[PDB]
Amino acid sequence: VTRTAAHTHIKGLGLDESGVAKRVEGGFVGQIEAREACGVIVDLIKAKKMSGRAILLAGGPSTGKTALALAISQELGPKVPFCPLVGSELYSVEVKKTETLMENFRRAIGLRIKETKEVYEGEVTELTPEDAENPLGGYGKTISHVIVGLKSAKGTKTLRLDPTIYESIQREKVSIGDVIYIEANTGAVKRVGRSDAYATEFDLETEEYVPLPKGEVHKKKEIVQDVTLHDLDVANARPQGGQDVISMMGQLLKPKKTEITEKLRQEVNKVVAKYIDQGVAELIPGVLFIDEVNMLDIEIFTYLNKALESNIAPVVVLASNRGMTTVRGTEDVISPHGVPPDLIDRLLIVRTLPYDKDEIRTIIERRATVERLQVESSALDLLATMGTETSLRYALQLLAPCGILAQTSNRKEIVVNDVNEAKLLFLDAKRSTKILETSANYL
Amino acid sequence: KETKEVYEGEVTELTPEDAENPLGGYGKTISHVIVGLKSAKGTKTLRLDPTIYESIQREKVSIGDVIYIEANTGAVKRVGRSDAYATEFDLETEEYVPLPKGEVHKKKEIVQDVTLHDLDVANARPQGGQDV
Amino acid sequence: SLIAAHSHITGLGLDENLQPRPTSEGMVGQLQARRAAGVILKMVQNGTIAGRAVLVAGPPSTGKTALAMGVSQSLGKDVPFTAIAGSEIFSLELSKTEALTQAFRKSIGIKIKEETELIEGEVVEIQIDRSITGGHKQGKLTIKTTDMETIYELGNKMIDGLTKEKVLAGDVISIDKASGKITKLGRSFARSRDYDAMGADTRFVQCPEGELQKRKTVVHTVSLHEIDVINSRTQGFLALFTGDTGEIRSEVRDQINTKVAEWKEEGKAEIVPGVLFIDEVHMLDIECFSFINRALEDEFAPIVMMATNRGVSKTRGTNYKSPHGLPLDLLDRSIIITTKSYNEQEIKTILSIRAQEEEVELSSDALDLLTKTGVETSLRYSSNLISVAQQIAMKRKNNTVEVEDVKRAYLLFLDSARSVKYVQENESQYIDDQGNVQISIA
Amino acid sequence: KSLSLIAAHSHITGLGLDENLQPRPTSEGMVGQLQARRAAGVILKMVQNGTIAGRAVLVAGPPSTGKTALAMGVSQSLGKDVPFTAIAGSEIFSLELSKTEALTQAFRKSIGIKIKEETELIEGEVVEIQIDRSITGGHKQGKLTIKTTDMETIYELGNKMIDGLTKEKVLAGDVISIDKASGKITKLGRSFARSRFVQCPEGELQKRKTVVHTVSLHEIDVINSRTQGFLALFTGDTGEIRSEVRDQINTKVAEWKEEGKAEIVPGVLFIDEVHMLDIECFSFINRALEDEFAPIVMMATNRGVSKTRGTNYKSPHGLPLDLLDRSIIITTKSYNEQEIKTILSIRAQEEEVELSSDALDLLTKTGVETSLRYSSNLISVAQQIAMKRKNNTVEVEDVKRAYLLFLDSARSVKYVQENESQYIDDQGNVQISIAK
Amino acid sequence: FVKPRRPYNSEGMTRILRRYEEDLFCTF
Amino acid sequence: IEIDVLCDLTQRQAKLYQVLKSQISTNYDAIENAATNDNLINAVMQFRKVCNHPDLFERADVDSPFSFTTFGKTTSKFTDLIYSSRNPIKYSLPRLIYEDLILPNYNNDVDIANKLKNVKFNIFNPSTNYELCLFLSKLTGEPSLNEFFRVSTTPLLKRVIERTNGPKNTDSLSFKTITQELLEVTRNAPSEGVMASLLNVEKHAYEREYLNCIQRGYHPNVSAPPVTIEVLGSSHVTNSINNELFDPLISQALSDIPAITQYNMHVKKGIPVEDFPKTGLFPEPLNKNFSSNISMPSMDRFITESAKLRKLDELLVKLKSEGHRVLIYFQMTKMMDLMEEYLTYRQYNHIRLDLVHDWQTNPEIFVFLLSTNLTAADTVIFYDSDWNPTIDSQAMDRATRQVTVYRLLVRGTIEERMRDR
Ligand SMILES: Nc1ncnc2c1ncn2[C@@H]1O[C@H](COP(=O)(O)OP(=O)(O)O)[C@@H](O)[C@H]1O
Ligand SMILES: Nc1ncnc2c1ncn2[C@@H]1O[C@H](COP(=O)(O)OP(=O)(O)O)[C@@H](O)[C@H]1O
Ligand SMILES: Nc1ncnc2c1ncn2[C@@H]1O[C@H](COP(=O)(O)OP(=O)(O)O)[C@@H](O)[C@H]1O
């Protein structure tokens, strides 16, 4: 019914009120100390006071680091922005990697503003233009002003327009008898559709039909809106939504990331500080998750060394599989987890332990219950032995072919013959490696 | 392989014949335009569409030019002025082509050889957007 | 169309019990790999499982790409199958992660339901009011069948579609209201007043009967990447064809994910998954492997099929060697289907299938020598030699292909080992690796 | 103020120095490094003098010793409108600007010009407006009554003021500012009428107001280049500004300074991790400080006898010998126990942490054995553990819990080294299996 | 009852008219 | 005789649930036990308000980008509307910079050096470089020798707008490429032709994919005008900026002329058609849905926002043939939502809180909503997911000689705990 994909079983960190964790709750099994550390981190995050904090989720492969990051995001909520990332995603061909990292830093910080909108909406009853006395004078436009008549429900008003607002009106291609929506904040117009008071069974353009808008014209309504600071930086660097010629030409041109200067970010900070001082906007700091942080070179770590010192920079969590591994982009500097020792001092390493046999067994059982598979006890034990023998992920990813073989053999339960056939058909890494070492023609 | 049924030749007259019962509030209600085409060994008078007159004034077609109207698409193509009607003896800048040969109504099969890459690069580029 | 190297596969050749026949649907042998590919096919057809990587491995000239195209033919209609190679990821205007995400979002599909009105009738009159410059276009249409006659108002796009495919009165046209199609089925009046300008000879059609407007419901398939380019900029439809989709932002992706979830919950749209096939996967970089590792674990992620013919070799972008050229963390997430080399009977059956498809008739002895040559050097060499033996036979004016023809073809065209033995004996003739050569005869 | 959460350097408010440039032992949030603070005070006086251009100083020492803290003290104690540019070393490597021209931009962003200008501004509280529309609308006349806390007047309006008052709809009771020269009206806010709120402005309308403008030389370079608007200052697409516009600007600001219409305000460029720059960037830094319109460049690095980027050899501080010859070096030393304790107490004071004396001494000992940033990260997370058990005071068990949960560098190094088979080495070999 | 048709404004533009018998073009 | 229906949770419902779960916290298991036993009660009612309808929490108004604008706002015959949007970021430039480096002056050299670099030393100048102009007039085939000097000294977008040129010399080196021949063929050509249909496949893909009726998925989050430059004390800056932002040629180019103005211009004032300023050069958007970033709240989407409401509307679709009544129960403000629902989309006979006996006499009417003897009703539809079965018994004290109880329930919430206990 519902599409499952990878660690969908996680519903949260599964902690208690005192700050402790139960063994099997919240979709997790084990890793009690890592769970409690991430709970203290998410409490620090909800405190909304510190900036430029960083932790590291260290450990081997297939150990639960990305699971812990997803659990943190689910414990945080939708209003707090979670910005997932991979280390390889910072290498863009349009713009330097430093600006991509700073754009992600600004993308993590959220904002929630209540906004007041001045709205003229209604049905266009009349629409007359007034020409100029010298239409080919070269200066000014071919019309002078335009009178338009809008009636909402239980109201009627006549509007006299300057040529720019009517230029937007005719760019949205209104006609007599259409329901329109003038936003006086930007001059943007939205054509709602034909009024349904007239006959609605004769058009040939699949037009929607809408009743009269309730209330008077010249409404003033309050909208709550959730935006990030990166949205403000992008919207000011590529200005669209105005009605001048720069905003009109900005829509049609090809978008391209540019190195946003520090002056724009400082001006956006001053404006958001004014919005906060007005009491209309609140600051919501969030997270940024660089999975596979070993993929970054030394230059991104050098820029992080300064970008964590900002007064607005969020809390950033990292993951790494490496042990004593040389840093990418350097020649002889060998460091733990592929992370240079300057960044390790700002970091707070959260270790993550490997699993046991029974923990693997209950993880496989929970994955079978998530995927709506029914498994007998003997096949579950055999899959647990296979997990401890080959790998955990090879045991988790073998449940689906046993399900396919089960519905092939007109059964729902997974017998031992099904997991034996799935062992035969699909190989793990080690058996395929032994096949590689015992072949001549580079199989 | 394609076929083309075309009309071309020197124009003799272009009369926007007004309609009987000519509506109201509009002058010049064309019922049809009569274009008299002449070429070598043939001359044909034609009864065209009321709408092709807009192309006639769009391409600046007057008496003394050679045009090119196709049967299916219905578009003029002003090739130039005839050599015989070089009335501006002193100073003119019109192109002058000889009067075309054969009948005005010539239908022929034309072969076109084109690569698939030309089709791809013609489909990919904007084909006459008339936008900024 | 033309005939290609994998044209003989017309499916995968398995039963309802997922048991392969010895020779069915143009495929012979490879029983375990065929059964495993059928299992993965049924797992795709279920659709509730997402982001599972399947790695096909074996020696060259075995049928890994043949197995992949067999899965593609058995995949059915309206299911995406993005078949790229390893080197399309590297680009000058796209990042590697962005090109991979574009491939991932091409491979997954959305089936959208729409409601559509069908109008078909004779045209009584057309009145079109265009402005002085021709910009604003508005007007009325009066279409008619034998039972009722209705008048519709026209918009700009319908009138512009009316100007092309010029519609005289008495023309039976079909109007699709949603798609905006105009289909002149023919002319039904055949008026005596005929214009000498117009050259149309549209066929005579019967007057339509029944009601004028007919409601129908239609379904069409569009991938996630197409909607991403469409919503990315104003002229996204042109960038769908010209490929000028330069690094679409993440905000667009988040909003289209929420939107297609909303369309799923309304019953309007249905999300079907697909198979993303990479050929010569080892050509990728290590950062591509890390992004594949962290992008298989997403909700919208297809069943990635991965093919390599390489043993333990150096992984690109790194200084070490790894099995299959793939690092161990990607091999952890991938289940490996292995393939095995053929015997003489399977090679003979392959060559017989190839000859039966390629419209070439062979004798028994020619087939035996082709089987022996195929089991000697390579299967692809004999499969290529069928063509030149056919052409030599038609140059000798005989319908069949004889043993002498394939012997002349074997003498004429060289294989790998013979060209190696001819290069090694004549090392002064060709340019060496140090760039030293003797072009003079003596 | 702006958007200011708690950062790593938030407690610094300058250099704790007297009038004789003698450093106080603990002042203005900064403690320790007495020689480094006196040297940075001398550099601060060198900036405030303004008669010295293009000097390079280098702060070098061990990590977590306060070189960035010293630079942030200099930045806070400079004041306002004296320019300060802070860049990391990994920022000039651009995909659309050359590295030397990015260095030229970072050099010229830190020299400001000071122009004083005076304008007439009308800022008052509007009593009422009255506009009479014509028979058709050819001419529009109207009257306007504005007032202050002291004065009261009536104005006759022409066409353009009425057009500029209908735009930005001004009602009775609003407080607006009218610019007479440019015809710009700004709505300051509604006055104190009960029916945003701002008090009614004081008297003496049409008052003389002097606004002092500080514009960096990079903005004038972008403005004077006619192919670049001022929108390149925000979008950041300048695209290798040529040399002739820069030399035109240099001559023009020189003649402004000699004419008396402007005054040059020199500033500080601070480069974090200058060892990540390459050899040709070092060469441009060598030959760019000679110019008269050049800032005083601060570089901070911690590498010692490292390789230089883009060359094969090794040089002290990661810097070639000529750049070290062109620069004077401030050496930072490490901290003893008492300075670490006072730093931790200042940090706990700023992060609003009420902590026990014994817990403070335990964090001090962890900051002696392990580097200071570990303990500074540990205070806030221990405070979160403290509120987790509903205690407002951080105790010793909270610090022990934070030590047990969050590992430092050396323990993680040991824990990797004992269990190397579980992780991934340089050759990409990992034993994911847990048994056999 | 039956709803009225939308008001069709045809003022100020040329008219192309095609009917069953003969074709028209009223231009300005 | 006994029906209990169960509904899942929609995405907006799950989003509101998870933000309430993360924000309030306060032991959600103990909050579940609090909802079992019945501030804590304010949390339980607000969780139930999330469970019933998103619009019972907050009304979903228009989805528009954040207007990063400062403008003329009303603090509260015609009232004229004038465009006044400005960027809140104001870049301040002194007058010295503008009047000394950008404008002409007696002590300035901008006009002199500008003429000397643009006209006097231009290589396309026919007065001093006639040979090069004649060379390029042979190559390109321009009829006018001043075309090269005019082209080299115009802004490029102004060159785009003023480009309409049809005479060309036939004795020139400018060529008609095979692609250009094919483009001239498919300038105007109908269907069923091979040479046009092989090159019009973009329109075929547009037509066959039903792509003119795909709804908009993405809108920008913040829309902002360009950064306003403010120079204090000079009206020349204001006039120049007003000229740059609102250039009449270019603003006329991206727009259209009203048809009445075209008729009054061409016929009444005798302006020729070619003398009109160029119009209609704005690109056509993909559908009508992509015309603007403001999205109107679809009333069809209001049904699908709440899963209980969607199942109820499906149930009414099945049950229009028979007469029943509906209980809205203990929740306030759900009345006006359901009221607006059936008087906005699907108009049904109804009555909402004598006239009770008046509907009891009327068999064809459906009662719908009531709050918390009525045996004339044939079927009561209600929730049964209430803490007090005494409230249930008082509700079914109302109770035609038939009952068919349908019980509305949402899964994956506190409602299931309520039902179980
Ligand atoms: N504590 C846990 N409880 C349940 N499942 C887990 C746990 N840790 C890891 N898993 C499973 O292991 C798989 C890999 O976890 P993930 O965090 O995505 O990668 P890694 O473990 O390499 O960081 C996931 O499918 C996840 O469901
Ligand atoms: N089971 C099979 N059925 C059909 N064709 C096959 C089979 N096995 C191999 N082939 C043929 O052998 C050739 C090599 O297979 P392919 O997978 O394309 O390359 P490789 O095996 O080197 O990866 C292909 O041309 C294919 O047609
Ligand atoms: N003298 C000092 N006074 C106050 N805080 C200091 C002092 N020295 C170092 N710190 C603090 O120590 C922490 C790390 O020092 P930092 O300046 O990052 O060292 P480095 O400059 O070597 O990187 C910072 O949070 C800083 O505030």
Give your account of this protein's structure:
Chain B: Belongs to the RuvB family. Chain B: Keywords: Acetylation, Activator, ATP-binding, Chromatin regulator, DNA damage, DNA repair, Helicase, Hydrolase, Nucleotide-binding, Nucleus, Transcription, Transcription regulation. The structure is cut from a larger assembly and holds two copies of chain A, two copies of chain C, one copy of chain E (28 residues) and one copy of chain F (421 residues). Chain A contains 15 helices and 19 strands. Chain A has helices at residues 32-47, 65-76, 97-108, 163-171, 229-237, 245-252, 262-277, 298-307, 341-346, 357-370, 377-389, 392-396, 399-408, 416-425, 429-437, and strands at residues 24-25, 28-29, 54-58, 82-86, 110-131, 143-151, 157-161, 178-183, 189-195, 209-210, 219-228, 281-284, 287-291, 315-320, 324-326, 334-336, 349-351, 374-375, 413-414. The longest helix of chain A is centred in the first third of the chain and has 16 residues, at 32-47. Chain A is elongated, with a radius of gyration of 30 Å. Chain C starts with 22 loop residues before the first strand and ends in a 17-residue tail after the last helix. Chain E has no helices and two strands. By secondary structure, chain E is mostly beta strands. Chain E has a two-stranded antiparallel ribbon with strand order 1-2. At the A-D interface, α1, α7, α8, β15 and α9 of A face α6, α12, α13 and α14 of D. β7 of chain A pairs parallel with β3 (79-81) of chain F. Bound molecules: adenosine-5'-diphosphate (3 copies). The site of one adenosine-5'-diphosphate has 17 residues of chain D, from β2, α2 and α12. One adenosine-5'-diphosphate (ADP) binds next to β2, α2 and α12 of chain D.
Structural class of chain C: alpha/beta
Strand count, sense and barrel status of the largest sheet of chain F are: 4 strands, parallel
Tell me the β content of chain C: 15-25%
Q: Main beta sheet of chain C, described?
A: 7 strands, antiparallel
Shape of chain F: elongated
> What is the string of helix and strand elements of chain F?
EHHHHEEEHHHHHHHHEEHHHHHEHHEHEH
Number of helices of chain F: 21
Q: What class, by secondary structure content of chain F?
A: alpha/beta
Fraction of residues of chain F in helices?
40-55%
In the sheet with the most strands of chain F, the strands line up as 1-9-8-7
Number of strands of chain C: 16
- What string gives the helices and strands of chain C in order? EEHEHEHEEEHEEEHHHEEHEEEHEHHHHH
PDB class: dna binding protein/hydrolase
Keywords: Chromatin Remodeler, hexasome, DNA binding protein, DNA BINDING PROTEIN-Hydrolase complex
Entry title: Class2 of the INO80-Nucleosome complex
Chains A, B: RuvB-like protein 1
